[PDB]
């Protein structure tokens, strides 16, 4: 078995709830354990980041 524990990752100034028609949990969803980081607005410059664990 596997033991899932949060990495406490949190971000400021981007989108973190990307969705896609493939991962379809009664609507456009994504991987339950992952985050699809996107720019705040379309085409907007994405900020360089560095997260550790």
């Amino acid at each position, epitope marked *: 078995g596997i033991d899932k524990e949060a990495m406490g990752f949190t971000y400021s*100034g981007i*989108r973190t709830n990307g969705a896609t*028609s493939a991962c379809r949990r009664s609507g456009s969803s994504f991987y339950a354990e992952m985050k*699809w980081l996107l720019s705040n*607005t*379309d*085409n*907007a*410059a994405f900020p360089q980041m560095t997260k550790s664990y």
Partner: antibody
Amino acid sequence: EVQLLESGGGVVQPGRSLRLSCAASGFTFSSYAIHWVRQAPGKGLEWVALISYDGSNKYYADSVKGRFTISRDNSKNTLYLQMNSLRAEDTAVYYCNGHGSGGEVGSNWFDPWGQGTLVTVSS
Amino acid sequence: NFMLTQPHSVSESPGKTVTISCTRSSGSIASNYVQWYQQRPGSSPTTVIYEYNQRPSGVPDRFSGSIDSSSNSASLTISGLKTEDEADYYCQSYDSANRVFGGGTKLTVLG
């Protein structure tokens, strides 16, 4: 059922201020980013401003920076464009226009436009 | 940063095919998506093409989008013109977050 309602248009003089509003109904307003796009009479379209889904980011046209200020109230589903220190050229029809992915990448094309509110600035 | 230049006007006989160009002054046309908008007199604009070639639900098969990386342009083409198509057309691309509109192209169908 999805619609955008521009309000607050009228005739003004230069140097004064104005405020515009857009009423959104028929879709998840809180998720898409919203844009202000105008068009002077006999002229073509010109993108004015945009604000993100959560108001964190606001992007203005270089020809309008400093004067206009965009804002939104998601609890009221309303868009606001603050056009203070107006000029003569700002005379145009003003459309509110939703334009954004909205969290989804498949994203059938969703780009609604209102009917546009006339803003005449004569002396 | 850049500007999109499209011809001031174009005309062609009904039933014939017509193409409208959209040339980007600085930066690759493939760097950012290009949307094609149709504006009829007095009416609000309606998107005819999005993401360089995608035909939204409702637009007939006559409308097609294309990219010419060589001339750094984007072309909107209508086959079998009809008098309803007589409107202004604007191409729009993206600077980093800001939208950029073309100069407009008055398409008149010969009557």
